[PDB]
Amino acid sequence: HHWGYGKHNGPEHWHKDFPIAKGERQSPVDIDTHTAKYDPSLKPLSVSYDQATSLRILNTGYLFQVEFDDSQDKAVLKGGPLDGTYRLKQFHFHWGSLDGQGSEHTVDKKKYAAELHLVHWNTKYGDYGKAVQQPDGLAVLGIFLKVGSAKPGLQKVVDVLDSIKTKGKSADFTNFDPRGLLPESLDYWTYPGSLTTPPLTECVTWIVLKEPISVSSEQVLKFRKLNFNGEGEPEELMVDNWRPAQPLKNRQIKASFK
Numbered sequence: 001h002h003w004g005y006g007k008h009n010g011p012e013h014w015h016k017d018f019p020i021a022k023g024e025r026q027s028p029v030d031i032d033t034h035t036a037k038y039d040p041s042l043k044p045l046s047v048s049y050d051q052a053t054s055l056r057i058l059n060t061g062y063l064f065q066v067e068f069d070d071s072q073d074k075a076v077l078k079g080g081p082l083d084g085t086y087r088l089k090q091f092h093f094h095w096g097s098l099d100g101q102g103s104e105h106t107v108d109k110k111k112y113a114a115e116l117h118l119v120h121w122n123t124k125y126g127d128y129g130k131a132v133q134q135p136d137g138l139a140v141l142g143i144f145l146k147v148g149s150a151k152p153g154l155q156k157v158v159d160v161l162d163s164i165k166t167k168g169k170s171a172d173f174t175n176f177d178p179r180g181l182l183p184e185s186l187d188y189w190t191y192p193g194s195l196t197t198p199p200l201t202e203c204v205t206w207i208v209l210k211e212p213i214s215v216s217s218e219q220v221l222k223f224r225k226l227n228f229n230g231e232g233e234p235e236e237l238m239v240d241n242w243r244p245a246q247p248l249k250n251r252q253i254k255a256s257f258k
Ligand SMILES: NS(=O)(=O)c1c(F)c(F)c(S(=O)(=O)CCO)c(F)c1F
Pocket: 089, 090, 117, 119, 132, 140, 194, 195, 196, 197, 198, 199, 200, 204
């Protein structure tokens, strides 16, 4: 009886194994665009993915993730609200059973069909496992997906998903360029928060881009053919793997723009 997304082990139950679920800096949150404050001291984000080295794609039983070689300073995120350098470790998505839900963050209560998270860890902490013990250990870049035109840079990901249908499957996934997943603008909101899955650690500086990317109905329908179950177990489609918005509490969301 591990955690997951269902009636019996979903977000409303996680607090019993992970009491920080009721903490003061939980994610995701609703971004109220009217109350987010423009902060002229923020910088433009620096997204430097030119040397990114993807290695593998994995169905974790909760989502799928594309992992990178983060044993050297290749693909990094800096600037914006961040102090120092954050190295890209992996990206993953959360998505819905229907095009009207699936994102973790919301914008003026709007839900998007999915949300991409690019997870980076602060190199001052030496590796990821140390970084997630720190209040400024991770920086997660969040990008909304809406359904419309296909995203060409997503198709390599979509087409390998049939090889990782079930929990614990991986496949080689080299030479994938995550720049193809980024919208035109790097305008963003930022706030201090948490992992959105157990253990829900409060170690994340969230940077959520305002501009969603467009993906096609067929691309997101291929996400929904993944399975939460292992091979040889009853089929449970991997859909609705998002945590709802959590209370903002004593936090301010800052805007990098207008
Ligand atoms: N959705 S999210 O981006 O907040 C997220 C992470 F990025 C994340 F890294 C973890 S983790 O548990 O440390 C394992 C993944 O690297 C998470 F638990 C987690 F929830």
